[PDB]
Design a protein around this ligand. Structure first.
Ligand SMILES: CCCCCCCC/C=C/CCCCCCCC(=O)OC[C@H](COP(=O)(O)OCCN)OC(=O)CCCCCCC/C=C/CCCCCCCC
Ligand SMILES: CCCCCCCC/C=C/CCCCCCCC(=O)OC[C@H](COP(=O)(O)OCCN)OC(=O)CCCCCCC/C=C/CCCCCCCC
Lengths: 309, 319, 319, 319, 316, 319
């Protein structure tokens, strides 16, 4: 269960990605509709009004429709949902990239596993009561496991760099999407002026067309712009949390003040970053883990077990 | 999972109303995407951009092609159909999504979700503990049941030390309820004020004379009365979603939910040392009492130091 | 789940009938959405807003465009087709949704749902108790089996003093049956009354002469007859539903379900000390007798104090 | 689940035929919903309301609009297309729903369902018990295994007393088979009689001369030949279904299924004390014999009291 | 039901080919339902009930309404379009459904299903039995595993007596294989002989001159060519199916599957007293050998009586 | 299932790419079935079978019915539209089905499937073995645990003797990769060559003058540009697929996977006598190295005969 390492920003971005995927699917389903553009020629040949006889068949009208749809309608108004689909697929793929790496997942599972072993161990509350038979043996075994974790994960820094990389990719993708979508949202217009040269096939050269779902695609584009704006603000806050304080180091000095143990050291690198992650999830976990990190506390446990046996 | 005990009757009712409103949104959206149109006929005789409305009967000849009719329909659907009659299902879908997000925000927000999961897990394991039956019955004890009861007692102490200092769950539930009534008021106002604009007869004046030959057209919006029905039904459901939510606000403000007293339990049961709890512990026990008060009773024995002493003495007899 | 023991034959029959009526509602609503239309031809010969109905034959020329025909269809569908012929499937869907909400309300309402889950759990654990098999047989006793039997005896006592005080489940079931029978009465009334309005041929008079040139039209409603063979069928199902509900109504008024008599069970078995349960305990035991009487038998041994004395003597023997 | 032992080959065959029949119903219903129509052309030359049926060729001009053609199609579909061609798939759907309800009535009806579940449970647990293998091999008997065998013997005796008193399951199965076979007879008779009415060419004379100008029209029903072959295919399925039901009925009338004889089983086995069960017990034992004789042979040793005495002696030596 | 051990490579291949034939049938049926139409234009110049086919060109005026065109389309679709082009998807549906029924009949028929499940259960239990591992390794033996091994031995002997008498499973599998191969032959014959009638251009002559004014029409069948590819590609699949079925038939005529020889296994193993099994048990051992040799080698140890004597003296 | 350990990263990537390609095939197939057409208009001025292209503007009167236009569209779509622009989605579907068959052939082919299932089962059981944890830490051994360790150690030896003889899995995987890359090459060649034939404007000279009046027409294929970009996207995926396959091919030509040296593990671990496996054992060990080397590390201590001797000695101590 990796949910303990998903902060509020990650969950919010995941739900925004789901919403954007819904928008893209709905837009594609709207694009499925056959009747897309409706074109009438220009300068066609109490008051009683009479209709203008354009003198065109239904097939001529359909030919004009497809000609003006291909050669007069802007490509954004025709391929916006597919771009939304591609962008949301990229967002979903690059939002789990820290989680689904081979070497990173094992470290994540090891950290959360031994941290849960802490959060369920009697020796943690026993150690707080010490500060303030079988369980002792399990305590000693878990303490060896904690030292194994220290020698196993603390060396590397793949997790922090990988998370920074995926956050930066999210930010730059958001910037590109916002820029080009805001630039091209003005091209989704209802009334279009089509000037294809099919005078030899139909008889007319200038047509006035209406894109029937141009209003719907404009609303969808504005909603997608709002969703991407919220996504990018969330990713910018993620970047700010990543770089406003050094996440490559974690100080246990708060536990040093709270817990009477001062042998508790300040771990670094991936240990520090994952401690910050679980602090975003639940700050009690790190405080309870600290009493297992220190080794003078291990000597105290060894003395207690020696006297008990 | 087992979050059904954390959802009182009002939350279940609002969830089901949200499901029905989502059904309304999907149905209206499918209809608006597939079959929503206007059937516009030009007004032959016009009187200052208004229809004049004037041997056997013979049909009026408008001389329009089918595509001129389609162009007139599209233009008078975009420019003269009211925005409510066009974007009602999408507004309903947005409102339902916001309502569902507000109702299920604290189940996804990590700080509140961790506390809720911890509470529900310890309460389920406490309610299913045989030590609860033995203690409320007031030396035979199974060994594994012995250290199970001891470890669960220690876990209850852990949880009380871990949750009782904070009130994030209560504040989040308050804010969710406040948003779910503010949005209900806004929805009811803007939906009742604009439902009358969903009409079947629409007179459009769009100035496409250079392409069609007529200025003013009389249009029939076929899927309007149905949209007048669904909206009305929606205005019904939201009203219910309001009233229920308002009751929740009353339930959260008639008394202080950040203080829970076990006075009845220590009145009936023998263990009178059971203390009073505060903050998120109190609010979550109130939520549990909204489902089944007995779940509180079997929890209370795990909050008492007299029960701890009795369990310690009997375990010490056992091993 | 295991709630099938709390659903007698009437509840299962109503659930299946509601499923079939929901299928009818979905089918009719799909047809209404996709293909419900009118095909209106103008009456050339008229007499005071009424169709006069007066070598080779030649077709009648109305000089109407396709879009004028579509407008005439839309206007006469909106104004002159009866509301029942247009909203029968939606009314059926609403009625089925309310029927299913009434049938499954006590399984979702937390106050009754908690007690029902409690009773189902204790009855199912008493059904599978080995002590029940040994006692109905009337020694050797695995210690786990002995303490589980004693703890389940105490659990029976605790569940009894928890539930016997109140009758919320019985009242809710009473209210659900009453709502389901008055709803059946209203449905059969207004549905039999308005079924004659689903006609194939409808004479529409909509006064759109300024747009079409004709005042009266003779519309054909293609989906009328199928709706009739739906509506009558729906009526039939409702009748069955109502009759079933009526039986359930009588089943809760023939004899007092709130005073369960264990007279036959205590007469057959050696244990003749079975006390008559009260209120919701009695009602749920009657609901269990509807499913399978043997369950009640296999529960009786946990309510008799004579079997409790036998178990206590046996427990003192092995302990 | 494990009711499959209660469904013999005829029940499985009828279930598969009903499934493919339901596919027929759904396919035909979809086709009748979407594409069932008539393409009607007026007969220009007529003699006494009958189609007279009388320089390159040039097309016949009827001077009819598209909407007049649509009205003619609707009226000649309603009034002159045979009801069988229009409502064949709905009739098939109704018939298959009744067939499936009759096939699975005893599984959902609580009285028979409880008895069948009890029988299946104790028969499967009798199969699982290794005492059957040890006894048919005829001490090597585990203490716990011996006690489970004794509990199984007591449960078998209790179930025999519980279920041998009545024959509700046999009566329900016989009634279901009789209803299925008589419904097969009615379906075959009416479908065979009315399958000739599904024709491609339909002459309609609907008297809409005031609205169209012609009295007689010749219509083509595009979904007729397919609606023929499906019907023929459906007929074939019913025949197969019917034949299967016939055999099942004969299987319930050749020998008394309420008087089961263990003659071969107790003759081959050492135990000659196995009594002949009766009524429902006999019925479910015959239904098991249809699946696998091994199940009945292993149940025979728990039905024997001499085997009970041997188990008692072996367990006696064990303690 | 863990029946995968009873399906050799031919059975899995035929199941996948039948699934793809199901997809052919559903796709073709959906197309024939929704968009199988005919576009018929009258032949203006008629020469003895046939089409004569004779500055600025001008379109030909037929003076036909759109409903007359629809009537002509329906009449020439029903009367003149060949029935193969109309009912190929329904025929492939029926054929592949019969293929699935033939494949799964012995799995659904209670008489063979019960015996199949009984044999599969004891084969799986003997495959995981510790005594099999000990004897193939061949005394240390716990009382409980010895008891369970003796119980499994008695089950093996009793089920051998129960099954070795009959041969219904092999007979049913044989009958299914012959029905599948002869239906392959029939399908190939009729489909290849009738695949040429799916044409894009069809001349229809329906004599509706009193209702339309023309007698001969030229019709385009838009979904013809696609069906052709479908038909042709469907034919390819059937060929593979038949070839696969052919091998199955050859396999079941290569040697008598009702007599299984443990000769290799009892020669290589220490136990040279393994008896030769007969009839159904022999056939299902042969199928399991076609799945994996190790299952048959391991079950060989539960049939010899020298292994029984060794187990008895170890238990003693 | 449990084959996730067997599939490396390239298999997962190719599976995802195949899923996206199948989405391409489904989308293109629905568009081809539903909306693929041509809208052909005749060229009034024809000079040697070529469109000559020679007050207020007025429309060209072609004097063609809607059905003649449909006939022209069907004939030109059939004849003068390239086969690629028509059957692109079906070719994509066939290619994806062949790719999926090649990628998942060894999991369905029984001879390789049995070996893979055996290897995965004993590897997972050895990973979950407590003796693995003891060996990596290098005691308290429950007798179930000890017998499991000894029996599964013997299982590992027997599996090595059973699987070391054959190399069918490696050969099958090699053939699958080679087919997947050669088909990649053919797909790229024929798709890239014919991708320029998906054009919007298409001239058709179909010679239907006796039925239409014109010989040459200028059609516009609406689902061309979209198809074009779909083809481009498909080509992109194919390229990626091909690249991945090449890496896999390179991964199976860099070193002989039939000779897996245990060098690094036997230097790191205390047991330096771990023999070097060969053939399919080595190949599946290399695959599990690609998935996770910890699997091979935990399986290595179950092959060494020094671990045989130490486990045997410690088991002797425990007996
Ligand atoms: C808010 C977000 C929701 C997102 C959901 C998006 C759904 C996308 C659906 C894709 C639709 C693609 C098919 C488009 C066909 C267009 C045909 C058209 O224009 O309509 C013509 C005509 C309708 O007009 P009339 O016959 O006059 O009927 C109206 C007056 N009774 O329709 C047709 O000819 C065929 C229509 C195809 C319908 C396909 C969709 C139907 C869906 C059914 C709605 C829900 C199910 C039934 C509900 C019953 C109540 C539970
Ligand atoms: C027993 C009753 C229970 C089941 C009933 C289910 C109800 C289903 C409701 C469906 C609503 C959606 C309908 C949308 C279209 C309505 C009007 C419309 O546009 O259709 C008309 C038009 C008719 O024209 P053609 O078929 O060319 O006519 C000439 C005949 N050669 O149809 C169309 O082109 C649009 C079709 C849209 C619906 C498609 C659904 C068909 C599904 C096929 C089911 C079978 C698939 C698998 C079969 C395998 C082989 C047997």
């Amino acid at each position: 269960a990796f949910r303990v390492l998903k902060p509020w920003w990650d969950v919010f971005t995941d739900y925004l990605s789901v919403a954007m995927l819904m928008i893209g699917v709905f837009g594609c389903t709207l694009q499925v509709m056959q009747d897309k553009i409706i074109c009438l020629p220009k300068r066609v040949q109490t008051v009683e009004m009479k209709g203008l006889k354009t003198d065109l068949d239904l097939q001529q009208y359909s030919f004009i429709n497809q000609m003006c749809y291909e050669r007069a309608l802007h490509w954004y108004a025709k391929y916006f949902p597919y771009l939304v689909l591609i962008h949301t697929l990229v967002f979903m793929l690059c939002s789990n990239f820290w989680f689904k790496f081979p070497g990173s997942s094992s470290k994540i599972e090891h950290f959360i596993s031994i941290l849960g072993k802490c959060f369920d161990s009697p020796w943690t509350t026993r150690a707080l009561s010490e500060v303030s038979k079988k369980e002792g043996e399990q305590a000693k075994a878990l303490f060896e496991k904690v030292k194994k974790f220290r020698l196993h994960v603390e060396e590397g820094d793949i997790l922090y760099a990988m998370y920074v990389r995926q956050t930066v990719l999210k930010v730059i993708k958001f910037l590109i999407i916002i820029a080009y979508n805001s630039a091209l949202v003005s091209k989704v217009q209802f009334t279009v002026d089509c000037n294809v040269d099919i005078q030899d096939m139909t008889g007319y050269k200038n047509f006035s067309c209406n894109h029937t779902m141009a209003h719907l695609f404009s609303k969808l584009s504005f909603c997608y712009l709002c969703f991407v704006s919220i996504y990018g603000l969330t990713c910018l806050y993620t970047l700010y949390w990543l770089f406003y304080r050094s996440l490559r180091e974690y100080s246990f000095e708060y536990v040093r003040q709270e817990t009477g143990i001062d042998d508790i050291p300040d771990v670094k690198n991936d240990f520090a970053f994952m401690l910050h992650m679980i602090d975003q999830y639940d700050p009690l976990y790190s405080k309870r883990f600290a009493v297992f990190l220190s080794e003078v506390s291990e000597n105290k446990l060894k003395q207690l077990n020696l006297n008990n046996e | 999972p087992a979050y059904r005990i954390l959802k009182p009757w009002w939350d279940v009712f609002t969830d089901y109303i949200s499901i029905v409103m989502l059904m309304i949104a999907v149905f209206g959206g499918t209809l608006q995407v597939t079959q929503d149109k206007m059937i516009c006929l030009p007004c032959k005789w016009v009187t200052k951009d208004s229809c004049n409305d004037s041997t056997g009967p013979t049909g009026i000849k408008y001389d329009l092609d089918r595509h001129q009719y389609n162009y007139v329909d599209a233009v008078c659907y975009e420019n003269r159909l009211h925005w409510f009659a066009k974007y009602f299902p999408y507004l309903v879908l947005l409102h339902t999504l916001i309502f569902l997000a507000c109702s299920n925000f604290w189940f996804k927000f990590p700080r509140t979700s961790s506390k809720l999961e911890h509470f529900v897990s310890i309460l389920l394991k406490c309610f299913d503990s045989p030590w609860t039956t033995r203690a409320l019955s007031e030396g035979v004890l199974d060994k594994k049941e012995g250290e199970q009861a001891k470890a669960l007692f220690e876990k209850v102490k852990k949880f009380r030390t871990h949750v009782e200092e904070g009130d994030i769950v209560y504040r989040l539930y308050m804010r969710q309820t406040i948003i779910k009534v503010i949005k209900f008021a806004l929805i009811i106002c803007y939906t009742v004020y604009y439902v009358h604009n969903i009409k079947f007869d629409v007179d459009c004046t769009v100035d496409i004379e250079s392409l069609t030959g007529y200025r003013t057209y009389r249009c029939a919006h076929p899927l309007a009365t149905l949209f007048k029905i669904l909206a009305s039904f929606y205005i019904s459901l939201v009203i219910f979603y309001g009233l229920i939510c308002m009751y929740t606000l009353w339930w959260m403000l008639r008394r202080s939910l950040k203080k829970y007293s076990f006075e009845s339990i220590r009145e009936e049961s023998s263990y009178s040392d059971i203390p009073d709890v505060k903050n998120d512990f109190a609010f979550m026990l109130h939520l549990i009492d909204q489902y089944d008060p007995l779940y509180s009773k079997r929890f209370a024995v795990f909050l008492s130091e007299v029960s701890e002493n009795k369990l310690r003495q009997l375990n010490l007899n056992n091993e």
